[PDB]
Amino acid sequence: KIGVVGDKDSVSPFRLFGFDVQHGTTKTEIRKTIDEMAKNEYGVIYITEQCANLVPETIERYKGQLTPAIILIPSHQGTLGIGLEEIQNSVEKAV
Amino acid sequence: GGDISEPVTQNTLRVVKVFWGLDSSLAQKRHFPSINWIQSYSLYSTEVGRYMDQILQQDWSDMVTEGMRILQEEEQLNEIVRLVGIDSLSDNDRLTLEVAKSIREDYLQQNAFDDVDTFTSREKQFNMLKVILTFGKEARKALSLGAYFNEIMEGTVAVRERISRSKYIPEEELAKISSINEEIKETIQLIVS
Amino acid sequence: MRLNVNPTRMELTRLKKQLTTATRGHKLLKDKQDELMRQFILLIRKNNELRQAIEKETQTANVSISVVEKNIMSVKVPLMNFQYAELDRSIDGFTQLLPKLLKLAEVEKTCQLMAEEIEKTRRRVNALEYMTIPQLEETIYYIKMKLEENERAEVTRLIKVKNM
Structure with a gap:
């Protein structure tokens, strides 16, 4: 069970595979996607970083939960650098 | 003081x-x-148990001792809840905590004000004890097979409401508390597959 | 730093037992903290190199998974099992992302789950060491002093009774 969220051009290639691909653009309905993507047991969700600055709350909420495995990805243009952020504060928070 | x-x-x-x-x-x-x-x-515990397992002819001696153990375990298992948390570990022990929860709240908590739980006859006093440790092992029966505990807890809640009431049912109709036992024999037949 | 006055005598020795349990707990959670950290640092180094790699590969560029979640005491850990010329190159570069970007999903998720739980455990150790234990020690002392004074405050009175 895999879902992906982002821009159609960059993400519709995932539809070749069995990925319930969305094209969400909203700040709250992106959560609404992810929330219906939460009560169905989709193991992993791929997210273009361009969509993640919209609804940052919802991936901090399920961050402590195993499912869904919320994953930030660059779109066809580029990432916003969510990798530089979250690996940096997470390593220092623990230690 | x-x-x-x-x-x-x-x-x-x-x-x-x-x-x-x-x-x-x-x-x-x-x-x-x-x-x-x-x-x-x-200190009259052992001998009272002998008299009463003869009179009622149910395995009362074995029931009251293990019913106390679920209480004893309940005490040792909140000692860690403060330290580690509820979902942290010993997941099968949560069932122990939520059946002891029913032990102290459905069996032990005896209000003397209500017109029926003012007094509970020995025979009726048997069924409540009986119902809870059946489930106590019926739970263990599902966690042995692999059925997630959250699923069973929903099965409880459906039938747990009934035993919450079991205090309030009159003496004469003990079959109600005898038959609700059969309903909890049913659930993990309909909730395991 | 005193809690509340609950003067009793057997309560003092039960408090000493509570103290030893707190120290036992503090001890257990301290070397649990280091063992959780032990693997955390291990996985970060896997996390960071997967992430950057992923970025480059993505930028130059029935099939469902079943995830049984394995366990390492506090959190559970996810293990991802898959159970299934420029045009073709884009699809395959994209296809080459698939076995990776999912492995990224593995490592990155385990890390954040560990990392969050470290903070929870770190809070508990800190709260136990700074608040719980010192409040216990200082209380049993003030309790000990009370009955020390009460004992001899009565002994003097008894001598007055004796001298009647």
């Missing part, structure tokens, strides 16, 4: 065989009657 180290309580507990220690903590929670089950003790 509630301190049982006083001369009166001390000299009494030296020439008695039965002691029902009350504590303000349970009376605070309105846990009535507020007898502390961890320390309260009766």
